[PDB]
Amino acid sequence: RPLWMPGATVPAHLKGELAGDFGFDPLNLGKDPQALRWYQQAELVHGRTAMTAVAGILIPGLLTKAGVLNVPEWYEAGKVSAEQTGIALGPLLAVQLFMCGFVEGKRWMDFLKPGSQSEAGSFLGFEASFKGTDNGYPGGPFDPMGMCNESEAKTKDLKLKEIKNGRLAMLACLGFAAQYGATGKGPLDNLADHLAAPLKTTFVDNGISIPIHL
Amino acid sequence: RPLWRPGSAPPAHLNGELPGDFGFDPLGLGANPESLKWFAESERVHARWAMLAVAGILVQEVVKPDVFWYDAPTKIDLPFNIVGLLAFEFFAMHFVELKRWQDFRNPGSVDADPLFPSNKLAPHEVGYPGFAPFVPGPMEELKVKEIKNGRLAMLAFIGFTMAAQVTGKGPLAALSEHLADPMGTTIFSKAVVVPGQVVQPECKIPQFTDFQGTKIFTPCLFQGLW
Amino acid sequence: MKNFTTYLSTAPVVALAWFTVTAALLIEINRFFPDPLVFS
Amino acid sequence: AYGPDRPLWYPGNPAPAYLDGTLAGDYGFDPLGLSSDPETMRWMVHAELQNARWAMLGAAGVLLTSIGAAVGLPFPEWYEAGAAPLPSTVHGDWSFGTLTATMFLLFHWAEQKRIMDFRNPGSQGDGSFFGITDDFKSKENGYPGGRLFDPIGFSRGDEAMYKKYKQNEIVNGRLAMVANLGFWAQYAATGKGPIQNLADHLADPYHTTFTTNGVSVPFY
Amino acid sequence: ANRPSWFPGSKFPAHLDGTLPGDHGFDPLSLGVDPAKLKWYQQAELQNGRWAMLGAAGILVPDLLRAVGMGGPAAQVPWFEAGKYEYFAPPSALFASMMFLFAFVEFRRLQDIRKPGSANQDPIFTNNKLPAGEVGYPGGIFDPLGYSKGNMETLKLKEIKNARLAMLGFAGFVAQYQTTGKTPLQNLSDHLANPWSTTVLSNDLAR
Amino acid sequence: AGEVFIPTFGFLYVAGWIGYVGRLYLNMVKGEAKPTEKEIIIDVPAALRLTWQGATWPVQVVAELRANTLTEKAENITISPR
Ligand code: CLA
Ligand SMILES: CC1=C[C@H](O)CC(C)(C)[C@H]1/C=C/C(C)=C/C=C/C(C)=C/C=C/C=C(C)/C=C/C=C(C)/C=C/C1=C(C)C[C@H](O)CC1(C)C
Ligand SMILES: CC1=C[C@H](O)CC(C)(C)[C@H]1/C=C/C(C)=C/C=C/C(C)=C/C=C/C=C(C)/C=C/C=C(C)/C=C/C1=C(C)C[C@H](O)CC1(C)C
Ligand SMILES: CCCCCCCCCCCCC/C=C/[C@H](O)[C@H](N)CO
């Protein structure tokens, strides 16, 4: 089985089953089966959220830097949209919290009790759809085009593609924040500046990554 | 079996089957059988390339004694642009080298005309494609002549290059300079390293030789260790 | 060496090492970043 | 070496039990029982097969650049060959910070694979890196034979030549390590760099010793 | 003793046995090792190829007519400029209309990749229907000249080869225009003038 | 915030890190042969394999509260006569 590091000792609770099980639990965090299950759902949610966010920071930018759109920088769009829409931060956030809270509540209870949201009579007409299939995979209303119903090996491929792309997107978001935090420019700007003089424009030569006093 | 040093004992790996075996592996390089098989292909390829080269350097000095073989490229007018000549040369050599290597990898696989399957080279030994329209004498005898001639040529080339770095002329001009003052043109007569002194021959090759407006770095082989 | 390393593992020796490293770290930190009153 | 009656370090004194004589360049020399532990021996053997190999390359450089600078060839002496301007690159210009980071980055990858195989033999030979397997295996601790590390096949060939070659490596490596301390200590006393120190000692051999250099012997 | 090899003297990939048309044993990155994927990837070669054969004949032709002068001002427009060229409706309307049109043909064709032999039937006219055919080779009305009897096998090994060449052709046109910034025929003429100095290397070196 | 506030969490994180790593080691040597001789002659190897495990101590500590494993049952702790 592919491992995060060749020769690394596979833990024990990480038996090839979860999508992306490369045997990486150095600090034995997922030792508890319940903890591992919650962490698995947490990972999927983190990856999916990051993938749908880095796509909203890179894609819109690459097209702005190609003249197609005019979207502002991810670290400036917030203010631009606030002054554009006119909605006050407070009201905008509060509404979002309530809507996100309700959807999170349903998913949360579905974990606490698997396939429980499909209670007879709960969500008017739809409870059935709110059943769920496996931990972080609410098949049905989600995955409408039925791509995870083709075979039992297209599921295991499409699921390794979600996790590897997610893990990458999650690290990409951390990078974008750190890049702007140190460089003070957009991600594309950083990449372009690096490709210009690759051997003279790195995190070392930024002034913030390593405060070299000596 | 003639040995490189009469009275020596040939290393076990050299039982002697390869043409031109003289039990010469002082450092035991071809100890690995597969390694020896590769080195064998390298020896033949090096010799054949060197044999053509040495001959060309000598001829290009009888016909056109002016252009120096070392700087010939910068002293000759290519009918085609170097970029174009290099491009064609790369693809041409790449094709022959690939088929040539594939035979060494899997013997008897590329022994056929890919464009015309009707044409097919007869079964042959690796290192010997099969192009033998004329073989003047026993194949093994001619094989020994090819390796002995090739080994001599390879040594001659290094001599051509080093002589071209110590002196600033080609093989014929250098030999004449020797024939003129035999006891005062030898390397000993032009370079001596004493326990305290270090006389090294001057490098007659400019560190960088400009070519068509592009200065080409031309270093004197280990000019520091002469 | 198995028994020398055992001695270098005894509580008094390990504590002497751990503390020396921790102390030196704080000393070196103030040496390059002096007067750290606030996290700014 | 490579014998029960192998020549020893202090003729007479018996050799240590852990030092049987198999290990390359074994002369039974461990006065402070540093390698009393068998696992310690393996680690110490690997470490020596690491310091000596780097030391050998380093000595080859301090001698080649030095020989050049003495003959005249523009070559900065080992001590001043760091302040020398970094050369440009097709990609761009080199920066000291990037250079150090790149040097450590690449080293971390190789060191990890080497140590991981050292801790778990054959771990690297799992076709994980582009299918390379046996080439990523280790013939012996400190001997990573293969078709990528021993291309010519000295290890794959006559074992006697391999064993002899192993002794050459250990003895030459130990000499290079000692030589390197010289290059550094002669510099931090003479301030001239080797091949100039060999040249001064061959011009006035009797009045150009360590005793007459100011730093070595303080009173003299 | 088997099919032609992309590189004579090399072994055939295990998954590539020769069943597929044009199976010259070429999958170095092992992209189509998965048989299920080999099936999708195969159909994608056909569709991507057939569309590129039309794309290459849709660029070389207009330029050929323009060069001869036979082509009208429309042909005088370079393919990489036809987008700006006016016609009757704005670029948006044309794209939207072609989308709706494509949705029907594409979905109807997919019904055949998903359930092979389940789309061959005129919806409006029950009487009209295509005969049984390999997924990817519709036949029937899609073969009006009835060439589906005369050596289908070698006419199919003629399509894949032409398709692969046409696909590399459309790559060359874009790449040459990406660097040279000229029409394909212009680049070809630039070569046939000084061919030993207008090579990509010389051009990129000059850049 | 840089004064007292932010510094507060910083100490709490390291404090819990030190405490969590300590309990991890204690509960590993418990059981192991003579647990009393691994407190005087500390097992520096295993002590060095548990130090980094306390980096994500908050995540592991909570997972233990929400699993009833951080504390001991009241009927297994000796208590002084009332
Ligand atoms: C794993 C080591 C460890 C841990 C996790 C704890 C944890 C705790 N101690 Mg405690 N303690 C320890 C060691 C430890 N102690 C030692 C060695 C001593 C002797 C000096 C004491 C003496 C002590 C007293 C007198 C009291 C506590 C109290 C407490 C509780 C209050 C929380 C607090 O602020 O800590 C408090 C910690 C201290 C006051 C001193 C200990 C601080 C040391 C430096 C930490 C131990 C590090 C350890 C050596 C690491 C081992 C690593 C291993 C690999 C070798 C708490 C649960 C209080 C309590 O009972 O609450 C009700 C209290 O009254 N401790
Ligand atoms: C469910 C459903 C239903 C049915 O079934 C169908 C359908 C519809 C299809 C489905 C859907 C799905 C989805 C949504 C998906 C998504 C995806 C994504 C977005 C990904 C991303 C993904 C993403 C990612 C990876 C990311 C990446 C990024 C990166 C690398 C970055 C990098 C960088 C950094 C850091 C910084 C600098 O300065 C710059 C750079 C250099 C640039
Ligand atoms: C097989 C293999 C295997 C191994 O493993 C790996 C590897 C090697 C990678 C692989 C390979 C692959 C490849 C090569 C692929 C390719 C593809 C292509 C190129 C396609 C085309 C494709 C192409 C195409 C479609 C084309 C298209 C086009 C079109 C529609 C149109 C256009 C135009 C024209 C007419 C003219 C006008 O005025 C304008 C327009 C309108 C604009
Ligand atoms: C464009 C990048 C192409 C990289 C070159 C080919 C991909 C290399 C992937 C390495 C994966 C292991 C190498 C091969 C392993 C064997 O075929 C089996 N799959 C593993 O035993």
Identify the H or E element spanning B198.
Answer: strand B198-199
Q: D47 to chain B nearest CA, in Å? A: 27
Q: What is the chain A residue with the closest CA to D121? A: A7
Q: What is the chain E residue with the closest CA to A150? A: E114
Contact D27, D8 (CB under 8 A): yes
By DSSP bridging, strand B192-193 and strand B198-199 are: antiparallel
Measured distance CA(E193)–CA(E195) in Å, rounded: 6
Q: Is B118 exposed, middle or buried (0-12, 13-18, 19+ CB in 10 A)?
A: exposed
* Longest distance between any two alpha carbons in chain D, whole Å: 64
Q: What is the dihedral of CA A181, A183, A186, A191, to 10 degrees?
A: -130
- How many Å from the N-terminal Cα to the C-terminal Cα in chain C? 49
A40 Cα: distance to centroid of ligand 1 (angstroms) = 34
User: Computed from CA positions of residues B138, B143, B146, B148, in that sequence, does the dihedral angle turn out positive or negative?
Assistant: negative
Interchain CB distance below 8 Å, D35 and C1: yes
F63 touches chain A (CB under 8 A): yes
Chain E residues within 8 angstroms (CB to CB) of chain B: 7-10, 194-197, 199, 201-202, 205
The CA–CA distances, whole Å, from C35 to B85, C29, E203 equal 70, 10, 62
The CA–CA distances, whole Å, from D112 to A6, B125, D53, E140 equal 9, 45, 18, 63
Contact A63, A55 (CB under 8 A): no
Interchain CB distance below 8 Å, D119 and A202: no
Q: What is the dihedral of CA A82, A86, A88, A89, to 10 degrees?
A: -10
The ligand whose atoms approach the alpha carbon of E160 most closely is 3
Measured distance CA(E79)–CA(E61) in Å, rounded: 10
Ligand 1 pocket check for F15: Cβ under 6 Å: no
> Residue B84: which of A172, E199, A105, D121 has the closest Cα?
E199
Q: How many CA atoms lie within 13 A of E138 on its CB side?
A: 17
A77 Cα: distance to centroid of ligand 2 (angstroms) = 20
Q: Which amino acid is at D192?
A: K
For ligand 2, what atom is nearest to the CA of residue A172?
Answer: 35
E190 Cα: distance to centroid of ligand 4 (angstroms) = 41
Q: Which of E5, E31, E87, E99 to mutate to test the pocket of ligand 3 (most atoms within 8 A of CB)?
A: E31
Q: Is D93 exposed, middle or buried (0-12, 13-18, 19+ CB in 10 A)?
A: middle
Cβ atoms within 10 A of the Cβ of D57, count? 9
Q: Which residues form ligand 2's pocket by a CB distance below 6 Å?
A: A 51-52, 54-55, 58, 142-145, 147, 165, 168-169, 172, 175-176, 179, 187, 190-191
Contacts 24+ apart (CB under 8 A), B127-134: B127/B40, B127/B41, B127/B44, B129/B100, B129/B103
Q: Which of D124, D130, D135 to mutate to test the pocket of ligand 4 (most atoms within 8 A of CB)?
A: D130
User: Computed from CA positions of residues D35, D37, D41, D43, in that sequence, does the dihedral angle turn out positive or negative?
Assistant: negative
> Residue F7: which of E80, C38, B217, D195 has the closest Cα?
C38
Measured distance CA(A144)–CA(A163) in Å, rounded: 20
Chain C residues within 8 angstroms (CB to CB) of chain D: 1-2, 5
Q: Which experimental method was this entry solved with?
A: cryo-EM
Contact D161, B28 (CB under 8 A): yes
Measured distance CA(E101)–CA(E107) in Å, rounded: 10
Residue owning tokens 């046109």: E173
Q: A16 to chain F nearest CA, in Å? A: 22
Q: Which residues contact B131 (CB under 8 A, 6 or more apart)?
A: none
Measured distance CA(F60)–CA(E89) in Å, rounded: 64
A29 interaction partners in chain F (CB closer than 8 Å): 56, 59-60, 63
Please list, residue by residue across D131-142, b when 16 or more beta carbons sit within 10 angstroms of its beta carbon and e when fewer do.
ebeebbbbeebb
Cβ atoms within 10 A of the Cβ of E109, count? 16
E197 interaction partners in chain B (CB closer than 8 Å): 80-81, 83-84
Interchain CB distance below 8 Å, D112 and A5: yes
The CA–CA distances, whole Å, from D50 to C1, D41, D42, D173 equal 22, 14, 12, 9
Q: Is D71 exposed, middle or buried (0-12, 13-18, 19+ CB in 10 A)?
A: middle
B115 interaction partners in chain E (CB closer than 8 Å): none
F16 Cα: distance to centroid of ligand 1 (angstroms) = 11
Contact C7, C13 (CB under 8 A): yes
Q: Which two tokens stand for residue D18?
A: 């852990």
Dump the DSSP string for D134-203. GGGS-SBTTB--SSSSSSS-TTTS-HHHHHHHHHHHHHHHHHHHHHHHHHHHHHHHH-S-TTTHHHHHHH
By DSSP bridging, strand B208-211 and strand B214-217 are: antiparallel
**3-state secondary structure (DSSP) of residue B209:** strand
Q: Which of E15, E27, E29 to mutate to test the pocket of ligand 4 (most atoms within 8 A of CB)?
A: E29
Measured distance CA(E159)–CA(E168) in Å, rounded: 14
E36 touches chain A (CB under 8 A): yes
Please list, residue by residue across D165-196, b when 16 or more beta carbons sit within 10 angstroms of its beta carbon and e when fewer do.
bbeebbebbbebbebbeebeebbeebeebbbb
Contacts 24+ apart (CB under 8 A), A17-26: A19/A156, A19/A159, A19/A160, A19/A162, A19/A163, A20/A160, A20/A163, A20/A164, A20/A167, A26/F52
Best F14, F41, F50, F51 member to test C by mutation, with max C CBs in 10 Å, is F41
Nearest Cα residue to atom 1 of ligand 1: F22
Chain D residues within 8 angstroms (CB to CB) of chain B: 64, 67-68, 70-71, 73, 75, 151-154, 156-158, 161, 199, 202-203
E36 interaction partners in chain A (CB closer than 8 Å): 151, 153-154
**3-state secondary structure (DSSP) of residue E8:** coil
Ligand 3 pocket check for E51: Cβ under 6 Å: yes
Note the resolution in Å, 1 decimal. Answer: 2.8
Cβ atoms within 10 A of the Cβ of E136, count? 19
B81 interaction partners in chain E (CB closer than 8 Å): 194, 196-197, 202
* Length of chain F as a residue count: 82
Interchain CB distance below 8 Å, E202 and B85: no
Q: What is the DSSP letter of B30?
A: G
Q: Where would I find the H helices in A55-139?
A: 59-64, 74-85, 89-112
* Length of chain D as a residue count: 220
Identify the H or E element spanning A42.
Answer: helix A33-54
**3-state secondary structure (DSSP) of residue E155:** helix
B185 Cα: distance to centroid of ligand 2 (angstroms) = 74
A161 touches chain E (CB under 8 A): no
Residue A139 β-bridge partners:
A142
Please list, residue by residue across A10-32, b when 16 or more beta carbons sit within 10 angstroms of its beta carbon and e when fewer do.
bbeebeeebbbbbbebebbbbeb
Contact E183, E194 (CB under 8 A): no
Q: What is the chain C residue with the closest CA to A213? A: C32
Ligand 1 pocket check for F7: Cβ under 6 Å: no
**3-state secondary structure (DSSP) of residue A159:** helix
Q: What is the dihedral of CA A118, A122, A124, A125, to 10 degrees?
A: 10
Q: Which two tokens stand for residue B79?
A: 């009918």
Q: Which of A155, A158, A179, A183 to mutate to test the pocket of ligand 2 (most atoms within 8 A of CB)?
A: A179
Ligand 4 pocket check for D127: Cβ under 6 Å: yes
